[model samples]
Target: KWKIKCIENKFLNYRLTTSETVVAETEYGKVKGVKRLTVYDDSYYSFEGIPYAQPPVGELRFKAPQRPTPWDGVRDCCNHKDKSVQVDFITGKVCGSEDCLYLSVYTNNLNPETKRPVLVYIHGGDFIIGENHRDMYGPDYFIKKDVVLINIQYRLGALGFLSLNSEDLNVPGNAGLKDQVMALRWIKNNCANFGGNPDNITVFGESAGAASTHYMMLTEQTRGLFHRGILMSGNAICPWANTQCQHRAFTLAKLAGYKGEDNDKDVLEFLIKAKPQDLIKLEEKVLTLEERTNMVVFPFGPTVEPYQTADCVLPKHPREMVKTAWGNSIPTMMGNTSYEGLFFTSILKQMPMLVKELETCVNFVPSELADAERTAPETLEMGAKIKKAHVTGGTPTADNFMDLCSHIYFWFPMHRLLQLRFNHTSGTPVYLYRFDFDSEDLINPYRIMRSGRGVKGVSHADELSYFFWNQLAKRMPKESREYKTIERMTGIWIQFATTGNPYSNEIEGMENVSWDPIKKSDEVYKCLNISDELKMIDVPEMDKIKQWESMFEKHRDLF
Candidate 1:
């Protein structure tokens, strides 16, 4: 047993454990974590909210992550740190700070003999929202399984991803990504003290977190940081690099009072030196509502900086990086959720009267093949075509246009990049999955309104209920089924972390279940549909999405 103590540091308190056996020391302090008694039990010591890099606020703004200066006193790692600046979950107002770059760890059995695999998770929020404290992402479930899970928080919005041009190379962008790299380095140096295998780490994330994993896979700076990766519902191919990002930075600069040539170094310096609140106010005034919704409070992403060298932080398009095999050869497991666009559809349905107004809000339009009419025939045909192309031959609707917009913006491009990885690299094994579990609470009404109405079924992010223990908005007796499904789902995830393969023949309710690898010949992906029972299905519609995505890639500039 280890005795833990909390001591005050420069800005926060840190929890430290005293141990003579453990051979580890961080710049902040020397400490130890709790050891597990059972092989697979939910108990382990954790150090929360450790800083990986210097805070990127004020003078350090827009710069790559800098190493934290050594401190003499012990730091308290008990409380959750501040989240990155982002829009409020309920009110949609900017609600965070620029001084937010912390990492948290959850572990089990810190015995050096265990050599347990380390699982590092990056939370998803479209690269603008999300935090380490979300109840759904708590590490208790994995800790019970004896896995060491580490969740990190990086700079978000403009503070994390403002790319500067050539002359302004002094302040390159993608500070958030740099923060992730620094955290990985920290883990590599310190995970052994927590009974984690530094050489056997698995990095995973959902949405933007997934995108960040893809970026890490493509960059040389993050090579050999992890042995395996799990990308949930994110892709590398999209309007997320270079020119588009440059325009975003320019917009931010314009708001900061820079009118001269969009790439002025002095303007960047002015923007960085300006008060963070002032910049927030100006951004609120100039940014569009659609941009605000998509990116929330901070709309900036990574930019192509000239000052960054290939070894430090290469600036290549995602596709180009894949074709060149930029990432280390690590086993990768990637998948997407069923009905990924349903979340947007539910929000759109809320304002039926403003359907047209909302369409224009995001500059959404139907596929060139989709008819403009809102009739059932047009709607069904469009939905079927898109579903066939992306999921399955479900049915198209006049709303298909909205679906296409969502896919083009987030889904198809991401999938295409994964395909590119499989096609370009043979050193790494690739496994794919499609999650199709719809919650009854999401489909059926609880007491009053039928919440699931039109946008029910297997909607976006619904698989989350089955992977982690979380409270349902509407509780019921039947929800236990979801918990059972989560048991099976989480087992597969744990097994994959233990070994490269997620295949299991001894799953409690699923004995004959075999999750096959996704290959070039069989673009068919393994589907996990946890409605009432856990079953595995094949999905070729997801392959079709890849096909249309290829076509789009060929003629995107033409479009």
Candidate 2:
């Protein structure tokens, strides 16, 4: 008979089941997890808080991750380990610890014959926050689908991303990214024991996680770590310009009193010698100052290392990486939410002058013809002309101009990147989508009252409810049609993970609803509409925006 034991004074619980032994040699020690009966036909063994690399603290701080030393005996894998030190967005308190290099694995039907696909998830928090323990990303749904789900925790903020030329060339930049790669290598070497197909691994993430997925796409060192990738609500090229690691290094140096020319080597040396508590204090101060800006916190991301110039670190831009014609094709799935910018604007209420300033800064001006039309004496005609111009130019109405700015600044770049990839590549399949389902509560409270009338639409991050079903967001009743939408979306995600295609006649109500790939000719895309229907639409307006993006790309050196 199997047994359930409570070790460490019952603070940790272990479910012993009638199955093969669950053993893992983590960095801290050898730990054994429990084989649990799953809801699906398959069984699973889960080991939470398993370390794949040595903790990046003290001298190891700001250095590339090293392979964890093997442990001796069956160490207890019962409790959650420390999380990376992060500034809480909602709460002001720091919510994680430095001892946070941990990973969790969930496998289905551990029978050696059934080598299920592995999915490693990197949670997104603007690269400075977030952990694998976020409730929205629990592995319950994925485990029910019979896929092995692995969640990885890497160093965040200065600890994980402080790049310096003075550091050994072998350990220059993108330590966090390297950490993720090491975790994949670990999974590739060990997943088979858990009945997972290491050869068919898929690395997927949302937001910053999605950006990291694209980073891996560009880096040759991570070329074959995962066979497939999914980028949700994040674009590679759109945000690449802001990903310079120098700003982060400067912040760390200023905090550590290293006032040298802000050289990468000097910054690395300072951080390596700084105390962890003092570093955390400095990070907090910098983040506090950054929050005052209208931009997203931790805007910078992984950069191409100087040493890895030989197609090892980053072979090409993300667009080139996914383009088959460029000889870097890797099958990828990319999509964005229907109201990708609504959440940011609505939550922050950044309207009026801030919105206008942002638009002007981005060089958006009314055309002379539109201005002439607006100056007409007829008030009604002027209003009509303004509305026409806004719609045709992909701008929002005067009342929601900030919403328009948010979309243009963020979503337009993403759309442009996708268009570039589609135009440049023919080998890899590129799927584009727009999620538009809106909950009644979200619309009624924020739209009907907050943003005046007809201004809210499908606010940003609303699709998260459909995918994560976050109860904190005050979603409508479960019996509501929105629940059906959630089911369809979640099922499609699971289907995509399994077969690389998200279509299933059972939920989508159509057989052979092949998600056609986007191409330069049509610029076709699937618009996940408000009525729980998917409509293939041609986005010429978005194409024009891509032209503007091209101008930016051509002049990137000037910037």
Candidate 3:
């Protein structure tokens, strides 16, 4: 009770300091927001925790989100809401809530006539965990560019992606992705009230969220909701983005103590009532030992819906829809860090047996390649080529392991996406980039937890701090490289969001650099190299790219 009183006192103190407030009218009701200052001390209005859909609980669990029920009177939208329930990666503890479909909007203008461009960010944690809380995704940088910035939260883990392959039950998987669609629809319908242009929305994200954005682009459900997409380090074709979840779904039911018959309806009935914490804790238990060791397989993620509903997000495999995605007509910008695999170094270092098996066995290949059946001659052949290219003398060196992981999980799939996109001439431009900006202070948390003290290169998500001011880190020093890098990154993103071209205007500090889209005529694939000095360069490591290409080309029918 004393702790509660102290928390209330703290809240009261905050309310007192942020006395100024702003209010906006939504389709559901009026939402009052607190006026807040950005890192630059510029004032902006923040409307947080606005429910985009009805809470997914009780009978609605493991189902697509429904439109929010309209409420009367002005609602307080000043505080962050609960994130989706999942196992936090840093703490290894179950956290967040099931009622987590909320979105926050930050804008510099409230006038309906302003109509600033909107940039919606989807957080990424391999589809099992993540949050849109400002503590991690502060809107300070984007607000300075006069863009309406929004962050969204969705269901995660088993609660979000469970599938029983039943038409009657209406749980065809991808509940979490459908939740994102609802949030985007909400932004389209209600963003005008927040001074955002309805037709100029740009959806962007990192990792699983980036793949989620790619998934949204492929389906007709999200058409016209977002005008463009910016994918950071992920795409729908990535092996982890697509998973066969029916077996895993039933396994989770067993883990939750379900002893009923094997029928889909019976399993769904038991799982619907299972404790949320139990469902979350048992999510990883569904993975087979091979999947657990390989580390590239995601047990729960976007899957081909068994019985398509009217609102089905993915009716067919994303690979089949690559050329025809509604998103192909829209401008796109996507890239990955220099060393995306470094994010898993700490985990890989603990599993020497898996590393040792990497060169000699087909068991360690990505599920996409192994799905042909690991014992097949073709699978073994491809695995041997991959091992030869990445592993030296059938040995798992630190550098070799990192390269192998990066290619299998990120680079190869992204290259396949680009190749598929090039098959058609839609006249829409697609810009590619490689984020190699190395900074001692600005590198992401994964870099700080490196297994080798001598390891060098920008790790996964290292570019995020240069775009958003992470509350966990100190502010970028004024006029320092970090600060200048922030200005350049945000400036480039803001220009793209506004004009559909990243170099539409001169980027601060990068004024001399020119960013051009990939051309079909170019002999080598081109990408903007993002670093201390920006340069347009061919993709590095062509030999390995050719190796993966040859493997995929030989097994074209499988994909």
Candidate 4:
């Protein structure tokens, strides 16, 4: 009664083949998955959309997640659950479900005697929008490496992160993080039954997901959940990661027709009683036009979890945590795109008035340049200087702003995090990378559309296509040099997951590898430049960093 092949061809990675009654036992219950043959030339067992927790609906809204009820019989998990309720990254619309705490596991081998390394991915659309869907993340890539892959879905937006106005630590925000923790807990208890080694786990994510990876590093709740981390492009230290959500909570409550003051109980009750759709609608309405300028801001993320009600993951600012080797015992691979900010500034630069608006944008960002009252006369002065610094050829252009933002918003903070982290302890080995190759097979053509203008040197997440095969990547000729790039990158990343050291960096065809850990004594900030070939580079011209650092020194309180 099912044309599985039709649905199979739709998803680039998943091809529904004949059913073989593959059953795996999880802690909750036994799950039945289909043995599907994929384009990767392999048959893997895929248990899709298995609920790790109960639906956080009804009275459970805004509270920490609870465990899922165990079922008596095997549940069909070939189809994934609805993604978290949020706007789709490529398509702008509400697409998912409130009952959406589910995870998928893929593995080429399920021999209980032989446990394989596990790679759990946290997809990123800025904590607001994203899912563990096959389109964005698939099993084909990791299966080739002989690794078991788990893709997870957690709540997003206000549903995931709505910091209450309570001075009491009863309901501090970070339900999203708690959701991830729950998923990991479930994986830990049940993965071994699915032929995955619970002790050898690697968690990796890009963009906001990368920031989540760093958060996992800080949280003691995740101590035994993972052994390795790979943070790509984003880190918790990014300016947008933390939000002063108390007042925003009050505003959303008022929008929902609550005339009462910021009494924690009144507001929480009203918001909890309100419809989920109403909350999202009012949240969107509450955001200003400028705040909606980018996809990064989705009104929620990790905060200092109240130690009273829960074991808070982040007890201090990232700046304070990175100072100590709190989570440095686990080996990590951290890096960023060459042109991450272009994703935002490029769109704005198209408008002639963007440079003037750039000042407004600077004020909105929490940085070290602002005043204690959240007011800064120096803001205008600093913003002007930044604009002047980045105005390419004496005018504000995408290229100029790209470097300025690409560095300030993401790269600098991530770089500082790694450097400070590595300086604290050279153990566990933290490898730094900058994806610099602008491959011709880049699917996001807008990145390189103005080839004559700005260099599209590996825009944000551009490196992802190389590691994971997608619609555009699957179509790429395997014989092309781009194919080699893909192979080399997968080899490098898989090696990190497989054996903690990125496989000696000697890599596939390269005889000698240059990937090195950062050492403070070396005084040379060398990073691995990833492209057609791997090369080590001395620090780039850090001339502009002086001003950035000076501003950070002045406004450390803003963040």
Distance from true location, Cα of 73 in model 1, Å: 3.4
Could you give candidate 3's per-residue lDDT for residues 106-223 as a string of tens digits?
A: 8866777477999999988888988887656878778777889999999998899987677898899999999999999999999999889998999999989899989989888987
- Candidate 1 per-residue lDDT, tens place, 410-529, comes to 556655565566667765667667776665642211111214444454555566555543323222343376545656677778778878887676666667666566665655556554
lDDT of 3 at 537: 84
Q: Taking the candidates one at a time, how many backbone clashes does each contain? A: 21, 3, 0, 3
Predicted model with the maximum lDDT: 3
All candidates: TM-score: 0.78, 0.76, 0.93, 0.88
**lDDT for 486 (candidate 1):** 56
lDDT of each: 0.60, 0.58, 0.81, 0.70
Ordered from best to worst lDDT, the candidate numbers read 3, 4, 1, 2
- The true-versus-predicted C-alpha distance at residue 522 of model 2, in Å, is 2.2
Worst 10-residue lDDT window for candidate 2 reads 1-10
**409-455 per-residue lDDT for model 2 (tens digits):** 45665665665555465456666666766556422222322343445
Error of 2 at 407 (Å): 3.7
Residue 453 displacement in candidate 2 (angstroms): 16
lDDT of 3: 0.81
Indicate which candidate wins on TM-score.
3
**How much is 329 displaced in model 4, in angstroms?**
1.5
**Per-residue CA lDDT of candidate 4, range 177-225, in tens?**
8898899888887788777888888898988888888887777677757
Q: Rank the candidates by TM-score, best first.
A: 3, 4, 1, 2
